[PDB]
Amino acid sequence: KAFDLVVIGAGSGGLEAGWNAATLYGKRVAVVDVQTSHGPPFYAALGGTCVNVGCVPKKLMVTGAQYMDHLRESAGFGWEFDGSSVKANWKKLIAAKNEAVLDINKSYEGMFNDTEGLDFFLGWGSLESKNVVVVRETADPKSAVKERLQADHILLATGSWPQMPAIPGIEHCISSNEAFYLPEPPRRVLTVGGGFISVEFAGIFNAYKPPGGKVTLCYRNNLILRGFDETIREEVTKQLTANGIEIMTNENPAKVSLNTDGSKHVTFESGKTLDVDVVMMAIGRIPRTNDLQLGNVGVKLTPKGGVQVDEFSRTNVPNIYAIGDITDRLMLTPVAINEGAALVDTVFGNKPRKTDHTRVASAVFSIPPIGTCGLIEEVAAKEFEKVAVYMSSFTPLMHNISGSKYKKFVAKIVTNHSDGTVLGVHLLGDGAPEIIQAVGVCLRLNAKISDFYNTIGVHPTSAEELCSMRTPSYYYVKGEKME
Amino acid sequence: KAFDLVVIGAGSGGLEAGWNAATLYGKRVAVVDVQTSHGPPFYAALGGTCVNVGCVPKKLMVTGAQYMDHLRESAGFGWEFDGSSVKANWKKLIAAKNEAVLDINKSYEGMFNDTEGLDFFLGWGSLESKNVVVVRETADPKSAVKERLQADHILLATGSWPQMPAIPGIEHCISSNEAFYLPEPPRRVLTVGGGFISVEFAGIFNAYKPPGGKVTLCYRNNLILRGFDETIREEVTKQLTANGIEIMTNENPAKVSLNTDGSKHVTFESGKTLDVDVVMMAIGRIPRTNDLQLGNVGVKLTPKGGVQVDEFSRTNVPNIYAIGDITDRLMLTPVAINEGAALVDTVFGNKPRKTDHTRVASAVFSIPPIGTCGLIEEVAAKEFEKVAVYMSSFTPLMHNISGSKYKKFVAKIVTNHSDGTVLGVHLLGDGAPEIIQAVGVCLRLNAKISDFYNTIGVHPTSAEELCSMRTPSYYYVKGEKMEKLP
Ligand SMILES: Cc1cc2nc3c(=O)[nH]c(=O)nc-3n(C[C@H](O)[C@H](O)[C@H](O)COP(=O)(O)OP(=O)(O)OC[C@H]3O[C@@H](n4cnc5c(N)ncnc54)[C@H](O)[C@@H]3O)c2cc1C
Ligand SMILES: Cc1cc2nc3c(=O)[nH]c(=O)nc-3n(C[C@H](O)[C@H](O)[C@H](O)COP(=O)(O)OP(=O)(O)OC[C@H]3O[C@@H](n4cnc5c(N)ncnc54)[C@H](O)[C@@H]3O)c2cc1C
Ligand SMILES: c1ccc(CN2CCC(n3cccc3)CC2)cc1
Ligand SMILES: [Br-]
Ligand SMILES: [Mg+2]
Ligand SMILES: [Mg+2]
């Protein structure tokens, strides 16, 4: 069958591109994915990674995890109940999450049913030729042909996949994919990785762990969450520790064996050992290009295995494009979506547009959470002669009463001190992901620190800290910190 | 007894002006207030209304009230506990609020002592003359002089005070001032009025009420929260109703009598009756001008009662200025603070600056809460030929799992459709007050709807809805509402 566009991967970027090309530009569109609903064996499905085994289910589970703090914190505000009656029922959480994800799967199914000129094909997409996508029964390229799709234009949108280190006993470890389907909450769990997925899952497991349970997070480097603001990295480490999570930095698994009861015996490179019920590898995500048989058309990959693209998401092969995680740049749903829309506008609208990968607001649903947009100070300090840091850090009042005195809210604004242009805003504490969104709009408008401090506060809020900072806390001048 | 600046009222506006003048411009400042710490008899104290009987304690108590919803909502996420064991200990909440407020009172005392040329004077400020403030022992102008203060510049920052309607039995009623100190949570309470204070307290009382408890809010007109977005006014009404609060609109107390058991018998203008344990009046606040003896220097008041000011906070009398609620405009702490910082940056900094009273971000800590900035559409529609309204309204997914299906999140952007300039942003739902702050910055920068929709979303948030709206839901054209443009 013949299409203006064939999209391989019915994910965040793929669905934006396919729906826009079909509905805004009246193109005949095919979209391919390996599953119509969430979970084993392929985990991602119609809707993509974010819907099925990412942002959507993890956010619901972090919300679930937050109640452990709310229940404890309620006492300071005079709430009384039988503490010994408190149980975290993980089965209910997983069932609630499964229903939520399945409902989305179903609506996307209804979307393809009800959208003329937008067709879904179940199976494994690969490139036969530069204008033919083959859909097969399995990821094995010798598996049965279900469809052959003639395509003026081909979009690769297959996303990414957990990285598993080749160590002895890797087979006894899981990724985030399996973590979403654990039938019982682990009593002891090691999250391996200092990234958002490890930190977010440490918080989820810490809340739902059965009595006498323990969550350990391990990371090779000295400080979790590289890429984030350093003050926030130190504070979130402290605040995770304060809520009972063991942060093992400068530590990495060397091998895993099974103890006689089926629990996992972890040997760290340092020789240290840990007995846990689950080992969750969250050490990285790699672009999913193996299964695409890109050798058939000579699309240029990087040694990492990402599809190389120009700013307009164009591969080295005309009429073949790549968006989203497969391009190994910013692995965010809204970036994927933005690239998909920009690509379709460019190619089918002749409305040339490229995604801006700078000043993207993002979040970490840690407990407590992070919101951030733009440059951290160390980065700004290499690119600008004079950099100012405006910093407010303090346990908010509600958390003196709550008993969570460790919950320091951090707000930091990084500026080009030569003109006061805001380069970065970095938040830690309840609300941070919600606060940072409109900050993304501020940085698009080249907001200066004067634009923040001349804006009238909403009081009382954590956000008003951003509009209450008149004076630098310190500077970088030619890369040197000057207190 | 000689100062560059004398400030009457150690509140939100008064202390910002005082501290700035002293620390930024090495000026000599006197600040007068009636009380050094919170509560009876004068309620407001060092730190002002907001710190003592306003934003700060109210926010702590709304946070306390939110745990009723979190404890119920936790069950959808798998939290299990003995629901019959749950009790709301009001006395604990009030004791914790009292300690939090006292620490702020003490924090301000430290500020005055640890700051050269910044001195606190206890007692009642009034104007003797153009350049002299008298501190007396009481509000009676006949009481003893404690001090006579020489002032190169006088700042009036005495704030506002609850209005109590002059109805038979008003003496059985409380204001917000007494609400903060109730020894026991009322079983039945009538919050009177449709403004933020009535709404916030109806939420607080609703969460802490003992078993068989009932919170009634009455409002004299048809729809609470006049001046807020109409969609949000209707929605908050529904969501308060859904959480057990009874909303009596077009109803107003004509009198209150004590029943023999100490409870209050409310007779409405309509003839309806209601027995409650507390009647909290929250029908308005009025500027505190009486006690300053303004007649003594001829400071002009408004047809309403507020000190008349120009854009630089100047009265008709030179060297005499007025900021905050005494001006009877926007009664918000950060507005008072902004006016104070501008007055001082003007007069002592030689850097004239005027508070912008448009595009002010503000909140209602209703459950769930409002965050708003700029014009509601009815107001935009009279000022602008073509107004677009962008609206998103849905129960977020977590609240389909929580079981609070009624918690619809509302996001509205109001624009000038001729250039896309955002004129206002109106939010109802968890985190709205936190979301709206950086929207205030966007409005200062003349953000267009395209600046929002071209900004990449943070996912998943409620906030990202603001970056997801490309197509108007409807328009006003020369005041007329319509789905489509001609
Ligand atoms: C645990 C986790 C949490 C995350 N949390 C967030 C968050 O909170 N916010 C955020 O913005 N981002 C988050 N992300 C990142 C976000 O999920 C991704 O950036 C986004 O899904 C990438 O979208 P995409 O279009 O590149 O691909 P995806 O949405 O992953 O879609 C790719 C699709 O292609 C399919 N597929 C793969 N190979 C083939 C093939 N050969 N043939 C057919 N179909 C194929 C897959 O089944 C999948 O559905 C998270 C990721 C994970 C793993
Ligand atoms: C229940 C309630 C909730 C509120 N919630 C919020 C909120 O969430 N957000 C917000 O922004 N605003 C809120 N406000 C409003 C806010 O409190 C005021 O806008 C703000 O306090 C006004 O500041 P001001 O500087 O005008 O005066 P105030 O802060 O009221 O300070 C006035 C001071 O003057 C003193 N005083 C009065 N007369 C004399 C005299 N003759 N001599 C000496 N001292 C005198 C008083 O003791 C008082 O301390 C709330 C108000 C109340 C009542
Ligand atoms: C979860 C959430 C809310 C409830 C209702 N109870 C709240 C507290 C009341 N209470 C006050 C003082 C003594 C009891 C009674 C109603 C139950 C379970
Ligand atoms: Br490091
Ligand atoms: Mg179709
Ligand atoms: Mg002093």
Side-chain angles (χ1 to χ4, degrees):
Chain A
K1 318 163 152 79
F3 291 94
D4 294 302
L5 176 62
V6 180
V7 182
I8 313 171
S12 294
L15 292 173
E16 181 71 9
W19 166 272
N20 286 10
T23 66
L24 311 181
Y25 296 101
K27 299 295 164 180
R28 196 185 184 254
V29 182
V31 179
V32 189
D33 214 295
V34 300
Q35 226 165 256
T36 59
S37 71
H38 63 94
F42 305 136
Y43 293 97
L46 182 48
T49 296
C50 171
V51 161
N52 287 283
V53 289
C55 343
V56 170
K58 81 90 181 288
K59 178 59 181 294
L60 291 177
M61 294 164 68
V62 171
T63 303
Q66 285 160 182
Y67 289 103
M68 176 173 75
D69 287 29
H70 288 318
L71 296 211
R72 172 174 51 83
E73 287 178 348
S74 70
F77 299 87
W79 291 89
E80 299 172 354
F81 52 84
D82 168 13
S84 80
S85 75
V86 171
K87 288 181 174 34
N89 184 341
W90 174 262
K91 301 188 183 311
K92 286 184 178 179
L93 177 69
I94 296 305
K97 171 275 280 191
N98 285 342
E99 188 191 5
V101 177
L102 188 57
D103 283 349
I104 299 173
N105 296 141
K106 288 171 170 183
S107 67
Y108 281 125
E109 200 165 78
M111 179 195 73
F112 279 102
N113 289 335
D114 306 344
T115 309
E116 307 293 352
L118 187 53
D119 291 297
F120 181 77
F121 296 98
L122 177 69
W124 291 79
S126 54
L127 297 192
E128 182 168 276
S129 62
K130 81 190 302 295
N131 295 95
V132 178
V133 171
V134 55
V135 187
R136 287 189 206 275
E137 210 94 59
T138 80
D140 194 326
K142 315 310 157 62
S143 63
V145 174
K146 307 179 54 176
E147 310 282 334
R148 297 181 54 221
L149 305 176
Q150 156 79 14
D152 292 348
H153 297 94
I154 299 167
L155 173 56
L156 308 181
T158 52
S160 61
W161 200 248
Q163 190 183 319
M164 300 292 275
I167 65 163
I170 191 61
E171 65 273 350
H172 302 315
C173 303
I174 67 173
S175 68
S176 54
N177 281 346
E178 295 82 19
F180 285 114
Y181 295 95
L182 294 172
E184 294 157 11
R187 190 176 61 89
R188 305 160 294 180
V189 48
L190 181 69
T191 67
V192 181
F196 72 107
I197 299 172
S198 186
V199 168
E200 286 172 351
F201 272 97
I204 293 163
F205 292 136
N206 183 50
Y208 284 87
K209 67 186 179 309
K214 170 50 68 155
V215 175
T216 302
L217 184 153
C218 73
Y219 180 54
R220 258 298 280 286
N221 302 310
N222 194 28
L223 181 63
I224 68 171
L225 292 168
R226 275 204 184 171
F228 292 86
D229 175 87
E230 193 182 42
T231 305
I232 289 172
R233 295 165 66 196
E234 286 161 1
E235 258 316 296
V236 66
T237 310
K238 284 193 154 106
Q239 295 186 31
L240 295 179
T241 296
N243 207 18
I245 293 146
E246 175 59 7
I247 309 297
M248 285 176 70
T249 48
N250 299 113
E251 296 286 357
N252 193 52
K255 56 168 168 200
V256 188
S257 61
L258 301 187
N259 294 316
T260 43
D261 58 6
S263 67
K264 279 66 163 192
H265 184 71
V266 176
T267 319
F268 293 95
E269 292 174 354
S270 80
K272 282 182 186 67
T273 51
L274 192 65
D275 299 302
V276 302
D277 300 297
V278 173
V279 183
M280 193 190 87
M281 288 292 189
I283 64 155
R285 284 187 60 78
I286 58 203
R288 275 173 87 177
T289 55
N290 257 122
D291 302 331
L292 286 172
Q293 310 307 139
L294 292 173
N296 289 351
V297 299
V299 167
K300 190 179 166 178
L301 305 186
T302 70
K304 229 293 185 73
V307 179
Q308 186 176 317
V309 284
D310 73 359
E311 291 170 283
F312 296 88
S313 304
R314 295 192 300 254
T315 70
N316 61 308
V317 183
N319 79 254
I320 307 186
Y321 319 106
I323 64 156
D325 296 357
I326 203 185
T327 67
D328 197 34
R329 191 150 172 201
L330 289 203
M331 292 192 183
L332 299 160
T333 275
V335 179
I337 292 175
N338 194 269
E339 295 175 340
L343 173 64
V344 165
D345 276 350
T346 300
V347 163
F348 294 116
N350 189 201
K351 280 181 131 164
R353 186 152 61 77
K354 42 184 226 219
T355 292
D356 187 357
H357 299 86
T358 75
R359 301 168 292 169
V360 182
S362 62
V364 175
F365 287 90
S366 45
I367 301 174
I370 295 175
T372 183
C373 183
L375 303 177
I376 64 169
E377 60 202 60
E378 309 93 301
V379 166
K382 299 221 133 85
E383 292 171 10
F384 298 89
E385 206 214 334
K386 306 203 215 208
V387 165
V389 180
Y390 302 73
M391 170 172 79
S392 165
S393 191
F394 61 93
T395 303
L397 184 39
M398 94 159 261
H399 281 315
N400 290 324
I401 291 190
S402 83
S404 297
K405 310 203 74 179
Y406 57 89
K407 284 193 178 174
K408 299 230 150 128
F409 195 93
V410 177
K412 296 180 52 184
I413 303 169
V414 181
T415 62
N416 182 177
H417 194 52
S418 296
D419 67 0
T421 300
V422 180
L423 303 180
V425 179
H426 316 282
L427 308 167
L428 170 64
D430 301 328
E434 295 297 351
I435 297 163
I436 199 81
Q437 179 69 94
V439 175
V441 188
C442 294
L443 270 47
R444 171 190 175 79
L445 285 170
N446 303 132
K448 301 181 154 42
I449 184 60
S450 48
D451 295 310
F452 281 87
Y453 68 62
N454 283 293
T455 299
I456 293 168
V458 191
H459 172 79
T461 64
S462 294
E464 58 180 311
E465 290 309 307
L466 287 181
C467 301
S468 287
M469 289 189 294
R470 190 199 166 91
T471 293
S473 309
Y474 53 94
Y475 305 85
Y476 299 85
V477 187
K478 269 159 300 216
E480 195 131 68
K481 197 201 156 161
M482 321 284 272
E483 214 111 30
Chain B
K1 282 147 211 186
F3 309 92
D4 299 307
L5 178 67
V6 177
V7 181
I8 311 175
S12 294
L15 290 177
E16 179 75 5
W19 167 266
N20 281 13
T23 60
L24 295 172
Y25 302 112
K27 291 282 148 160
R28 300 215 150 291
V29 177
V31 192
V32 190
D33 212 294
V34 299
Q35 209 173 269
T36 60
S37 69
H38 70 94
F42 300 145
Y43 287 101
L46 177 57
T49 293
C50 176
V51 164
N52 290 286
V53 285
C55 342
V56 168
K58 158 282 281 304
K59 179 58 173 305
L60 290 182
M61 291 163 71
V62 178
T63 302
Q66 280 161 4
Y67 291 110
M68 186 168 76
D69 291 24
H70 292 314
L71 291 189
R72 170 175 54 79
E73 286 177 351
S74 72
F77 293 84
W79 293 85
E80 288 172 5
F81 50 81
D82 183 350
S84 75
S85 77
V86 172
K87 306 182 193 318
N89 190 336
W90 175 257
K91 308 176 174 298
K92 278 181 185 176
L93 174 70
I94 299 311
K97 171 278 281 184
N98 282 353
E99 190 66 20
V101 175
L102 182 65
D103 284 344
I104 293 158
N105 293 139
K106 292 174 164 169
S107 177
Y108 278 119
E109 157 160 52
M111 187 193 70
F112 270 97
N113 315 316
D114 290 2
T115 302
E116 227 324 283
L118 181 57
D119 282 278
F120 183 70
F121 289 99
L122 180 62
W124 293 84
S126 56
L127 304 163
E128 184 152 277
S129 66
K130 300 172 219 305
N131 283 72
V132 171
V133 169
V134 55
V135 188
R136 295 187 181 284
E137 252 136 33
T138 85
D140 191 315
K142 311 318 202 192
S143 71
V145 178
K146 308 189 48 178
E147 290 286 12
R148 181 168 277 93
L149 306 169
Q150 189 82 226
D152 284 353
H153 303 107
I154 302 188
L155 178 58
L156 310 174
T158 54
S160 54
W161 196 254
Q163 182 173 44
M164 299 297 271
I167 62 161
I170 190 60
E171 64 262 47
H172 306 316
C173 300
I174 65 165
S175 71
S176 63
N177 285 336
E178 294 85 20
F180 287 110
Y181 294 91
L182 287 166
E184 297 207 329
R187 190 169 76 80
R188 305 155 295 176
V189 42
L190 184 65
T191 65
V192 185
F196 80 97
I197 294 168
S198 186
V199 168
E200 296 180 343
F201 266 98
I204 288 161
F205 285 139
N206 185 52
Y208 285 88
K209 67 197 184 295
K214 190 66 194 174
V215 175
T216 308
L217 173 153
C218 68
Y219 177 55
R220 87 164 202 207
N221 308 306
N222 194 53
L223 182 68
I224 65 177
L225 289 170
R226 274 195 178 174
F228 293 88
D229 170 275
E230 193 169 35
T231 311
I232 290 182
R233 291 165 73 196
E234 276 160 359
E235 261 310 310
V236 160
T237 298
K238 279 185 167 146
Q239 303 192 203
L240 293 169
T241 302
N243 206 26
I245 298 160
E246 172 70 29
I247 311 297
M248 283 170 81
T249 50
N250 308 303
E251 296 281 4
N252 196 47
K255 55 169 177 162
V256 181
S257 70
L258 275 187
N259 299 323
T260 71
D261 65 2
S263 70
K264 284 81 213 179
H265 187 72
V266 182
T267 308
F268 290 84
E269 287 175 1
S270 68
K272 285 182 190 62
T273 66
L274 182 72
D275 293 308
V276 297
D277 305 294
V278 164
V279 188
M280 195 195 82
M281 290 284 182
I283 52 87
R285 293 174 59 77
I286 51 197
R288 283 170 87 180
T289 51
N290 269 208
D291 299 335
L292 291 160
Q293 307 301 169
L294 291 181
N296 290 16
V297 292
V299 169
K300 185 51 158 78
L301 310 195
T302 46
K304 268 161 203 166
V307 175
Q308 196 171 262
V309 286
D310 72 358
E311 304 174 306
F312 289 96
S313 308
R314 285 175 319 195
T315 59
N316 57 338
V317 188
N319 315 7
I320 304 204
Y321 319 85
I323 70 189
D325 291 2
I326 198 185
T327 67
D328 187 38
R329 191 184 192 166
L330 302 169
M331 292 205 191
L332 299 168
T333 273
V335 180
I337 291 176
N338 193 266
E339 296 185 300
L343 170 62
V344 165
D345 273 347
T346 293
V347 174
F348 300 118
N350 196 213
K351 261 86 170 142
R353 184 174 75 243
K354 33 204 134 145
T355 297
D356 181 5
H357 289 87
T358 78
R359 301 174 291 172
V360 186
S362 65
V364 178
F365 290 97
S366 53
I367 298 166
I370 298 163
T372 181
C373 185
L375 306 179
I376 68 175
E377 62 203 61
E378 308 94 296
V379 172
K382 288 166 198 217
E383 276 194 39
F384 294 95
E385 186 206 43
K386 291 183 306 193
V387 166
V389 178
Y390 305 69
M391 185 174 148
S392 164
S393 184
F394 59 81
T395 300
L397 172 56
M398 72 139 279
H399 276 312
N400 292 328
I401 298 158
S402 79
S404 298
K405 298 281 297 275
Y406 63 84
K407 294 191 176 186
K408 281 190 176 42
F409 191 94
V410 179
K412 295 179 67 196
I413 308 179
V414 179
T415 71
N416 177 1
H417 191 63
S418 296
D419 74 339
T421 298
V422 179
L423 297 180
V425 178
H426 313 289
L427 307 172
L428 169 66
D430 296 331
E434 294 291 350
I435 293 159
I436 201 81
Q437 176 71 84
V439 178
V441 184
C442 295
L443 269 59
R444 182 190 159 87
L445 293 161
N446 301 123
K448 304 189 165 54
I449 186 60
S450 66
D451 294 319
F452 284 84
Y453 63 60
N454 289 327
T455 291
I456 298 184
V458 190
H459 179 67
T461 65
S462 308
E464 66 179 314
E465 223 47 53
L466 288 177
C467 298
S468 298
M469 299 195 267
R470 316 190 160 261
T471 302
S473 310
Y474 59 89
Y475 304 84
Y476 297 77
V477 180
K478 311 189 160 217
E480 200 190 354
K481 198 210 264 206
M482 44 195 65
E483 223 218 306
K484 309 294 277 293
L485 292 187

